[PDB]
Amino acid sequence: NTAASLQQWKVGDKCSAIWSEDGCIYPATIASIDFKRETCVVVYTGYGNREEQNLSDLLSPICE
Ligand SMILES: CN(C)C(=N)NCCC[C@H](N)C(=O)O
């Protein structure tokens, strides 16, 4: 189940995010967090793409 919904993040943290385009988990680092939108922008590592994710949706990063 999705137990990791108790996520609290800071900018510059590595994580994994769901790509809007494929819907898959990809490695991304937090570029900015807007606690009011309860969301944060992540930059997909290796790609350079950036999109906004929910703090609670963010998953633990890769082993890199
Ligand atoms: C998780 N991400 C961002 C990716 N798997 N990206 C691949 C496509 C990257 C290209 N700049 C584009 O956005 O079209």
Swiss-Prot record:
Changing residue 51 to K: Impairs SMN binding to RPP20/POP7. Abolishes the interaction with ELAVL4. Abolishes interaction with SNRPD1 and SNRPD3. Impairs binding to substrate containing dimethylated arginine. It comes from the Eukaryota. It is found in: Nucleus, Gem; Nucleus, Cajal body; Cytoplasm; Cytoplasmic granule. Changing residue 49 to D/S: Impairs binding to substrate containing dimethylated arginine. Expressed in a wide variety of tissues. Expressed at high levels in brain, kidney and liver, moderate levels in skeletal and cardiac muscle, and low levels in fibroblasts and lymphocytes. Also seen at high levels in spinal cord. Present in osteoclasts and mononuclear cells (at protein level). The modification Phosphothreonine is found at residue 2. The Tudor domain mediates association with dimethylarginines, which are common in snRNP proteins. It is linked to Spinal muscular atrophy 1: A form of spinal muscular atrophy, a group of neuromuscular disorder characterized by degeneration of the anterior horn cells of the spinal cord, leading to symmetrical muscle weakness and atrophy. Autosomal recessive forms are classified according to the age of onset, the maximum muscular activity achieved, and survivorship. The severity of the disease is mainly determined by the copy number of SMN2, a copy gene which predominantly produces exon 7-skipped transcripts and only low amount of full-length transcripts that encode for a protein identical to SMN1. This is Survival motor neuron protein. The chain holds residues 84 to 147 of 294 of the full protein.
